[PDB]
Amino acid sequence: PDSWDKDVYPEPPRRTPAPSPQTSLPNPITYLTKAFDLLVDRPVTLVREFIERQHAKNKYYYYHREFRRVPDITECQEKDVLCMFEAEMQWRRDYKVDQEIVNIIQERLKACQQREGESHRQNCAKELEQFTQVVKAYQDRYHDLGAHYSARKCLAKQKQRMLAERKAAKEAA
Amino acid sequence: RHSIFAFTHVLIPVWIIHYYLKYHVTTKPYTIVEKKPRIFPGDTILETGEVIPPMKEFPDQHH
Amino acid sequence: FPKYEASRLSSLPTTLDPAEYDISSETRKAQAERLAIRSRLKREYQLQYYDPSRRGVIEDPALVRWTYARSANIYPNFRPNTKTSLLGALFGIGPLVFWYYVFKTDRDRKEKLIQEGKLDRTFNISY
Amino acid sequence: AWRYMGGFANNVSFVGALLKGFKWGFAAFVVAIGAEYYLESQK
Amino acid sequence: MNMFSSLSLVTLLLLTMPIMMMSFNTYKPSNYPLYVKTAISYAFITSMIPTMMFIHSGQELIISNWHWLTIQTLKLSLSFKMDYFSMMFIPVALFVTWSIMEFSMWYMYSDPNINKFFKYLLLFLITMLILVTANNLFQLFIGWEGVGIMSFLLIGWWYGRADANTAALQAILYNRIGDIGFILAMAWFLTNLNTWDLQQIFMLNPSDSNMPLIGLALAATGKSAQFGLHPWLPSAMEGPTPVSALLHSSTMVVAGIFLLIRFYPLTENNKYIQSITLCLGAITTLFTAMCALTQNDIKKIIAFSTSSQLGLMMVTIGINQPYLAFLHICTHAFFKAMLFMCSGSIIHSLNDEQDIRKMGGLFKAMPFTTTALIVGSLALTGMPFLTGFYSKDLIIEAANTSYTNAWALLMTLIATSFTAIYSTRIIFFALLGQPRFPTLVNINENNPLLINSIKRLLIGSLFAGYIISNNIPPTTIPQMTMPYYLKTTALIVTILGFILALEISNMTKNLKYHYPSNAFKFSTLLGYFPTIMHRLAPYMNLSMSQK
Amino acid sequence: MLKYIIPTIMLMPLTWLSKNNMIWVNSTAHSLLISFTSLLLMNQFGDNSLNFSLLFFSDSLSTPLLILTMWLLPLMLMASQHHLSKENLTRKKLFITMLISLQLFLIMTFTAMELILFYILFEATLVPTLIIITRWGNQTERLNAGLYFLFYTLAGSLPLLVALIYIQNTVGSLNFLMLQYWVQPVHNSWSNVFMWLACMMAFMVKMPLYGLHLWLPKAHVEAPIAGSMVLAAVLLKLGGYGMLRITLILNPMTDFMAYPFIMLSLWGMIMTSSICLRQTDLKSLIAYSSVSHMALVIVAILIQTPWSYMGATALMIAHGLTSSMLFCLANSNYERIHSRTMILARGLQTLLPLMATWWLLASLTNLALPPTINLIGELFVVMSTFSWSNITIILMGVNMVITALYSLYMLIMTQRGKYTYHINNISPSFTRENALMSLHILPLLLLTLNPKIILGPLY
Amino acid sequence: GAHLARRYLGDASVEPDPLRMPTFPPDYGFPERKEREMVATQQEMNDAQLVLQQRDYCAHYLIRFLKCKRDSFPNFLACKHERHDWDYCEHLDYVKRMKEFERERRLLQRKKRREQREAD
Amino acid sequence: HITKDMLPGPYPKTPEERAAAAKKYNMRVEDYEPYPDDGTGYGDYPKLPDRSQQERDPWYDWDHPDLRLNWGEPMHWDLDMYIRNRVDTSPTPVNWNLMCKHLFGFVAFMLFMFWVGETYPAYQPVGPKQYPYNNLYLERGGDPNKEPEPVVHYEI
Ligand SMILES: C[C@H](CCC(=O)O)[C@H]1CC[C@H]2[C@@H]3[C@H](O)C[C@@H]4C[C@H](O)CC[C@]4(C)[C@H]3C[C@H](O)[C@]12C
Ligand SMILES: *C(=O)CCCCCCCCCCCCC
């Protein structure tokens, strides 16, 4: 959480109306807001500075693992386990990553719904549009494989789709 | 007694929740998503100092 | 005011019970007899219940029989009893057959629609 | 006898209980509209 | 945002701390009930602060602080939703519970497990704020089944009694039958959409959603004791009266409606369900109210008053007025809690007697209790400009002036009349006439706790509806133009109900013998649904088991 | 795995060479330590399992079943030492040896990398299991129920041997990792249909499936507490673990060869849950609860979907802790009233306040109160079987309604009402009995805070 | 609705259909019709986040109301004057709907008489 | 440590067996009667009347109060089903059939009445409400690119 990369997790610019009090009565929320800032915001903010100063004193780093692409199951010889094992572990990693892609595109669709309030049905067409594409791509990739899903079964499903898609194209002509 | 209650059972809990929400929950995407404020005609925007155009003139009903 | 029409879950009241009205020497002896057995059992239990030195359970032989009779295995019954055992055969492999076609046909229909694209699964991602 | 005497004898009717306190209620009401009438009269 | 989000969660964490100090620490036993009462005292005030902010600018939050579980493309978080329904309901529930926690300190003073009782009252409240603030369906289930258990544990508070244990198991059995509908909705949304979160459900808005809504409606049928699954709510009066006030009349029973109020975005489009919810509400409000007239126990009558009202909430859902039903829930809580608390004073003064036949002549012996028993009863029927008026009146206006089922429109009005008849029967038998209770008089209600508790909710039954109705933001296009008779149909039937009631009471004075009418016996025995169904079904399931 | 096998072996020299009075303290304290080091098996990777050697591996499906297995041994020693206080020391030590022998076979059973090594260790477990249940079993009632073994061996263990041997001659290996990369479709054929039954009937009996379940209630009535704890907690799971592994090489035949079995399990849930209501013996009521719960696991395994496999793994672990907790609670009464009748002792909450709390938690998790892992498992199985066919929600719903009834009916009968007047030997609960329950329900509740570890390899 | 008896108990073709109305083109008897005018821009309603069902012709008053209230906090009795405006504006809006109903009713009877006499 | 003879045995087929059975169950011979002899498995257990414990007098001093049983008394086969908490068979104020008929009439009648209401709805006499901008086509989620069918609402 260095800071949610704004591109990945976007939020539209904030437009807040300025305080325009016409009435003469006092506004309690304004008073409580100041009391909260003094009583809560600052003594806490001081604590976080004391912790943060010591955190920067001892600074050590962790890195994000890099995995070289390796030949896919399409390049593996039949029953050659050492080739299939490399191909199979790689596919599992991507199957796992693609799941977190759908979640990200889901998190957007849920953030837009709340943010746009009562007008959400119009102001979230792009977010709904993106969510339907990722879902369709995911469905074709990984749906129906089963509990014992594998790269060989993912390939077989794809090869079945292409044949039916290929055949269909001919019938049009 | 109420002061002992308030400090232990209200003030201290709200520091923990504020430290937690401000420096752990808000530092992650979409954790707290708030409905965008209602913008009415003839309002002033804090960010841009913008002024929304006024509404058309009403049909001047008897009111 | 029609009399009370008794049912299995609607017992006939004692007050309107036809028999209770006329108790003769035969009936009087029986109830005295029943009280005799009841009286004797109460005595046997109360001696153990009130015994100062007892720290334990007054094993009720009647309870043991009830548990033993309920928890029975194969000592009764004859295998080729048509009136009862067959009625047991229906109530056992009967419902399993019914639910077979209830679930076979449904999964046949769903698969056929999926094999034709008719079924809509736009967001069906978790299975 | 005790149920029908000694202070239990007098019990108001359904309407009477419903209108319990009305006498004070009306007094406060009539004065109330006067205040708004008068206070508004002074603008 | 800072203040709204922080103080939205102090309330939830403030209530838990008394639970936490039971498991550890040893600073204060003996004084636990007052320690708990203060937590709700403070949790209410802290809960008002966000409510004022919502009124001022309509601010709404979702807080998903914790990531708990990621089942592939399904992510479950501890998400709280502080919106229109959460912000308004929480202060109302806390305010009502505040008084009850104080009325329990008196009603349950002698009982040696008083500390255990307050632990269970608080543990319910915690599982109710979870239910209302929940943002995803799974978290909704924790509250849904959390309250269901806490009913069992509290209904059967006196576990020596064999009826208490039967009544507790009955509460579980009906709710879990309803919770078949809840899982069906949970399965449908995951299968057809892809989340249990409410946000994504409303964003996609399935056009064909007959199945999930039947499942959701079935949960409300069991949780809120609608017809078909209603017998448990009367039989759940076996618990201590503070339990019946806090759970089975003020709050917990509304969760069945609260589930449908959550899902208005979907139910608004689906007419086919609107008919079912309207029909389902229409029968229950009539049937229970019809049963209420001939009952003889004060707790039982007020129990059927809850069911009859709850059906009126279900009709409001059907006629596509979800925001009114929410208003009815909030206004309904105040006076129905006060009724039970007042009936608690009578029962405690008359030495544990619940039969109104043996009550009477209390109109002067218990001033404070009698005043509230009148104020509460007037709100229920529809006394103008009382807390009950702001909700019930509009509901009748919107039912009369909307495309609806004719019979359902008629049953609602008939039941509203009946609401007048048994509003009096409590007053006439319990407050008016010569005394009929045993000789030795110990009627004494001069205690600060019982009085302060009753006093506070008495104010709520007067001004709470006026404040709430004014402040909450507009959300629908209210109908204010209609024929005069439809406009005042509510008041007329209420007035016509009173006239018939008072005449019936007077006929009871006249020295004429009693004559049994089939309509009368059907009323008293609850339509024979409890007797037939609690005998045929248990017999068949238990008997079929051995085969 | 040798880091666990060896120290488990060294428990036998520990038991035999200890001071006569310190066998329980040593065996419990050192069997507890072994379990602590078993948390190192959660070194799991997303893509690949944790493979230690040519013989043993540990993926996410065996890691919980291994940690549950080694957590149970110290519990089974605490549970059993009270009713073994009478009998002499040499007979006492052999009982502990049989339990240590059972753990050693079970840790090797769940981690065996080859299916014959699994099969042999899968049948070797019964040797200690039967000695414990027949030699130290409380019942000398004479059953003649060995026909259930004669049925089991002839119809279960023998066909599994001939099929496993047949498969190796064809595929060429029985290494589980190899079968992942070398598996071929199972074409329809009357010879293949017999291969499918051979590879599954052995595990269906142990679950047990409906119709093959009648052995379980009888075994629980005979067995000592230790026998029932291991039997319900683990040995039932060997069938579940066996079917999760072996369904890899049975596709696509499982699509149509699983219809008859699912109809037994789905309808089996209702039949056994209803029978629980009419039971008069605690151990039989708990024994029929296991058959009703395992009926979900059989359905979950056979519909083979990513959600069902997560459901089955959570249920297997959650059921193990719950049911063994119920068996212990039932034994605590039996160690007093000295009978297994439920009706005999009533209103026990008046005399044993804290014990009534343990009963309440055990019942709540059995009826599946959210957010316990008992419901995380059950919910997932319900979600997936809904996709398999929406009608199943009817059978799944009814089973939830009945399950709450015997769960609480058991609570009401034994813990509520008026105490039996004549029973005057309800001495206060011992610290041994309270510590034993707390070690079933503290881990069970804490798993809700981090449920991913028990959700299996499909997570 | 006394009118209901007319439709179900009385003759059907004469009474309007609550669902299928209207059944005549707008100008069949209304030469020169003035299109209803929406004061509030689409952007404004969307910016106000007005509930969709409240996004009708009377919005402009409703928008003014809410603006007053948000300013008049914590006073909640301040904005009575605006409240009436929107409420009345709906009342006039409702009336127009009533006129739409009757216009249908009159035409249906007029059609009935015309074709009947010709059919005679 | 209980005797085998004092435990249930096979169905009695001769009066001497019956005399032994009745004695075995602490019952007088006249009362004793076993179940019909089939494979149901009741053996020689007494077939007591099918009545719930709720019927028995609450004012007697039973050995087990809550159950309302007496020590050594024969126990009904389905006793667990007939405990107070469960199936209750107390005499009812009304005839069993009469309760069923009335309840069937009430429920069945109302459902048809709700059917009738659906067939002939109830509504106010007002025209369908009108909305601006092509019935809020854009605000209802319609496609921006595709153009709707223009709609016009005229004053009246
Ligand atoms: C914090 C203190 C521990 C030090 C001590 O033993 O005095 C403990 C002792 C008794 C406790 C108090 C009692 O539990 C109840 C007090 C009365 C009201 O309920 C407010 C909280 C209340 C004021 C508590 C606050 C705090 O927890 C106290 C004050
Ligand atoms: C609709 O729900 C109300 C029906 C009640 C009948 C009213 C008849 C009396 C009024 C006739 C003249 C007024 C014209 C509407």
Side-chain angles (χ1 to χ4, degrees), chain B residues 1-2 4-5 8-9, chain E residues 27-28 31 34-36 38:
Chain B
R1 290 167 73 75
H2 290 297
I4 302 310
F5 184 90
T8 53
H9 280 93
Chain E
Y27 54 87
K28 179 65 74 67
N31 198 22
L34 174 52
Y35 167 50
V36 165
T38 302

mmCIF file of all heavy atoms in Angstrom, chain B residues 1-2 4-5 8-9, chain E residues 27-28 31 34-36 38, ligand 1:
data_model
loop_
_atom_site.group_PDB
_atom_site.id
_atom_site.type_symbol
_atom_site.label_atom_id
_atom_site.label_comp_id
_atom_site.label_asym_id
_atom_site.label_seq_id
_atom_site.Cartn_x
_atom_site.Cartn_y
_atom_site.Cartn_z
ATOM 1 N N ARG B 1 -17.496 9.362 37.920
ATOM 2 C CA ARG B 1 -17.652 8.041 37.321
ATOM 3 C C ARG B 1 -17.842 8.143 35.816
ATOM 4 O O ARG B 1 -17.200 7.421 35.047
ATOM 5 C CB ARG B 1 -18.830 7.319 37.970
ATOM 6 C CG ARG B 1 -18.557 6.912 39.400
ATOM 7 C CD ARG B 1 -19.816 6.483 40.119
ATOM 8 N NE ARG B 1 -20.299 5.179 39.686
ATOM 9 C CZ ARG B 1 -19.743 4.029 40.041
ATOM 10 N NH1 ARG B 1 -18.666 4.018 40.815
ATOM 11 N NH2 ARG B 1 -20.255 2.884 39.613
ATOM 12 N N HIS B 2 -18.716 9.046 35.374
ATOM 13 C CA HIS B 2 -18.927 9.222 33.943
ATOM 14 C C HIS B 2 -17.642 9.645 33.247
ATOM 15 O O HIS B 2 -17.390 9.254 32.102
ATOM 16 C CB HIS B 2 -20.030 10.247 33.706
ATOM 17 C CG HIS B 2 -21.389 9.762 34.090
ATOM 18 N ND1 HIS B 2 -21.997 8.693 33.473
ATOM 19 C CD2 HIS B 2 -22.256 10.198 35.032
ATOM 20 C CE1 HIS B 2 -23.185 8.493 34.015
ATOM 21 N NE2 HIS B 2 -23.366 9.393 34.964
ATOM 22 N N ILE B 4 -14.584 8.753 34.159
ATOM 23 C CA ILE B 4 -13.774 7.545 34.030
ATOM 24 C C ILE B 4 -14.316 6.672 32.910
ATOM 25 O O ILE B 4 -13.552 6.059 32.155
ATOM 26 C CB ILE B 4 -13.728 6.781 35.365
ATOM 27 C CG1 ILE B 4 -13.169 7.665 36.483
ATOM 28 C CG2 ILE B 4 -12.889 5.530 35.221
ATOM 29 C CD1 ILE B 4 -11.865 8.357 36.150
ATOM 30 N N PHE B 5 -15.642 6.589 32.789
ATOM 31 C CA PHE B 5 -16.236 5.867 31.671
ATOM 32 C C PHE B 5 -15.887 6.528 30.345
ATOM 33 O O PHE B 5 -15.428 5.865 29.409
ATOM 34 C CB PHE B 5 -17.750 5.793 31.832
ATOM 35 C CG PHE B 5 -18.431 4.987 30.766
ATOM 36 C CD1 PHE B 5 -18.634 3.630 30.921
ATOM 37 C CD2 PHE B 5 -18.862 5.588 29.600
ATOM 38 C CE1 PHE B 5 -19.253 2.894 29.938
ATOM 39 C CE2 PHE B 5 -19.482 4.854 28.619
ATOM 40 C CZ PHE B 5 -19.677 3.508 28.787
ATOM 41 N N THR B 8 -12.139 6.061 29.281
ATOM 42 C CA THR B 8 -11.727 4.692 28.996
ATOM 43 C C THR B 8 -12.593 4.046 27.925
ATOM 44 O O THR B 8 -12.091 3.267 27.110
ATOM 45 C CB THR B 8 -11.767 3.855 30.271
ATOM 46 O OG1 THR B 8 -13.052 3.983 30.887
ATOM 47 C CG2 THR B 8 -10.696 4.313 31.236
ATOM 48 N N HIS B 9 -13.890 4.347 27.907
ATOM 49 C CA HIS B 9 -14.833 3.633 27.058
ATOM 50 C C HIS B 9 -15.378 4.473 25.913
ATOM 51 O O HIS B 9 -16.343 4.057 25.268
ATOM 52 C CB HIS B 9 -15.987 3.094 27.899
ATOM 53 C CG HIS B 9 -15.659 1.830 28.623
ATOM 54 N ND1 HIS B 9 -15.188 1.814 29.916
ATOM 55 C CD2 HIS B 9 -15.726 0.538 28.230
ATOM 56 C CE1 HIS B 9 -14.983 0.566 30.292
ATOM 57 N NE2 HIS B 9 -15.300 -0.229 29.287
ATOM 58 N N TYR E 27 -12.684 -5.848 37.698
ATOM 59 C CA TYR E 27 -12.762 -4.547 38.355
ATOM 60 C C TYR E 27 -14.103 -4.345 39.053
ATOM 61 O O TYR E 27 -14.156 -3.746 40.134
ATOM 62 C CB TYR E 27 -12.508 -3.435 37.336
ATOM 63 C CG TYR E 27 -13.402 -3.481 36.121
ATOM 64 C CD1 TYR E 27 -14.640 -2.857 36.128
ATOM 65 C CD2 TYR E 27 -13.013 -4.147 34.968
ATOM 66 C CE1 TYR E 27 -15.463 -2.891 35.023
ATOM 67 C CE2 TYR E 27 -13.833 -4.187 33.857
ATOM 68 C CZ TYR E 27 -15.057 -3.558 33.893
ATOM 69 O OH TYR E 27 -15.885 -3.586 32.800
ATOM 70 N N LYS E 28 -15.197 -4.823 38.461
ATOM 71 C CA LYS E 28 -16.532 -4.563 39.001
ATOM 72 C C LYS E 28 -17.509 -5.667 38.622
ATOM 73 O O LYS E 28 -18.109 -5.646 37.539
ATOM 74 C CB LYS E 28 -17.062 -3.212 38.525
ATOM 75 C CG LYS E 28 -18.460 -2.876 39.030
ATOM 76 C CD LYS E 28 -18.503 -2.697 40.534
ATOM 77 C CE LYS E 28 -17.869 -1.382 40.959
ATOM 78 N NZ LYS E 28 -18.662 -0.200 40.504
ATOM 79 N N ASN E 31 -22.235 -4.777 39.939
ATOM 80 C CA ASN E 31 -22.770 -3.555 39.354
ATOM 81 C C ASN E 31 -22.779 -3.616 37.829
ATOM 82 O O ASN E 31 -22.687 -2.585 37.162
ATOM 83 C CB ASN E 31 -21.964 -2.354 39.836
ATOM 84 C CG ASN E 31 -22.698 -1.055 39.648
ATOM 85 O OD1 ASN E 31 -23.924 -1.034 39.538
ATOM 86 N ND2 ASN E 31 -21.956 0.045 39.618
ATOM 87 N N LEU E 34 -25.789 -1.766 35.581
ATOM 88 C CA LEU E 34 -25.632 -0.332 35.384
ATOM 89 C C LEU E 34 -24.441 -0.027 34.489
ATOM 90 O O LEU E 34 -24.454 0.963 33.751
ATOM 91 C CB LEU E 34 -25.482 0.362 36.732
ATOM 92 C CG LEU E 34 -25.171 1.854 36.707
ATOM 93 C CD1 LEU E 34 -26.155 2.601 35.838
ATOM 94 C CD2 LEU E 34 -25.187 2.399 38.117
ATOM 95 N N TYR E 35 -23.406 -0.860 34.545
ATOM 96 C CA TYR E 35 -22.286 -0.703 33.628
ATOM 97 C C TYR E 35 -22.735 -0.881 32.188
ATOM 98 O O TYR E 35 -22.329 -0.119 31.305
ATOM 99 C CB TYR E 35 -21.191 -1.702 33.988
ATOM 100 C CG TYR E 35 -20.118 -1.857 32.947
ATOM 101 C CD1 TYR E 35 -19.483 -0.758 32.402
ATOM 102 C CD2 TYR E 35 -19.732 -3.112 32.517
ATOM 103 C CE1 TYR E 35 -18.504 -0.907 31.456
ATOM 104 C CE2 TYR E 35 -18.758 -3.270 31.576
ATOM 105 C CZ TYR E 35 -18.144 -2.169 31.049
ATOM 106 O OH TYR E 35 -17.166 -2.341 30.102
ATOM 107 N N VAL E 36 -23.579 -1.879 31.931
ATOM 108 C CA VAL E 36 -24.103 -2.076 30.584
ATOM 109 C C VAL E 36 -25.004 -0.916 30.188
ATOM 110 O O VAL E 36 -24.892 -0.378 29.082
ATOM 111 C CB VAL E 36 -24.840 -3.420 30.486
ATOM 112 C CG1 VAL E 36 -25.676 -3.470 29.230
ATOM 113 C CG2 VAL E 36 -23.845 -4.555 30.500
ATOM 114 N N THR E 38 -24.970 2.095 30.882
ATOM 115 C CA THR E 38 -24.235 3.289 30.491
ATOM 116 C C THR E 38 -23.638 3.135 29.100
ATOM 117 O O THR E 38 -23.563 4.107 28.343
ATOM 118 C CB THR E 38 -23.148 3.595 31.513
ATOM 119 O OG1 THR E 38 -23.746 3.771 32.801
ATOM 120 C CG2 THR E 38 -22.422 4.864 31.140
HETATM 121 C C1 LIG I 1 -11.136 1.771 35.788
HETATM 122 C C2 LIG I 1 -11.509 1.221 37.201
HETATM 123 C C3 LIG I 1 -10.349 0.286 37.682
HETATM 124 C C4 LIG I 1 -9.597 0.946 38.840
HETATM 125 C C5 LIG I 1 -10.331 0.683 40.151
HETATM 126 O O1 LIG I 1 -10.417 -0.490 40.597
HETATM 127 O O2 LIG I 1 -10.852 1.637 40.784
HETATM 128 C C6 LIG I 1 -12.738 0.466 37.174
HETATM 129 C C7 LIG I 1 -13.129 0.116 38.632
HETATM 130 C C8 LIG I 1 -14.855 0.039 38.634
HETATM 131 C C9 LIG I 1 -15.285 0.500 37.139
HETATM 132 C C10 LIG I 1 -16.634 1.172 36.909
HETATM 133 C C11 LIG I 1 -17.780 0.210 37.105
HETATM 134 O O3 LIG I 1 -17.597 -0.876 36.261
HETATM 135 C C12 LIG I 1 -19.170 0.900 36.759
HETATM 136 C C13 LIG I 1 -19.026 2.500 36.716
HETATM 137 C C14 LIG I 1 -20.411 3.138 36.632
HETATM 138 C C15 LIG I 1 -20.935 3.409 35.215
HETATM 139 O O4 LIG I 1 -21.353 2.197 34.683
HETATM 140 C C16 LIG I 1 -19.872 4.009 34.271
HETATM 141 C C17 LIG I 1 -18.649 3.111 34.228
HETATM 142 C C18 LIG I 1 -18.014 2.937 35.610
HETATM 143 C C19 LIG I 1 -17.476 4.291 36.058
HETATM 144 C C20 LIG I 1 -16.862 1.900 35.458
HETATM 145 C C21 LIG I 1 -15.614 2.435 34.786
HETATM 146 C C22 LIG I 1 -14.237 1.539 35.111
HETATM 147 O O5 LIG I 1 -14.338 0.356 34.485
HETATM 148 C C23 LIG I 1 -14.040 1.277 36.576
HETATM 149 C C24 LIG I 1 -14.021 2.650 37.252
#
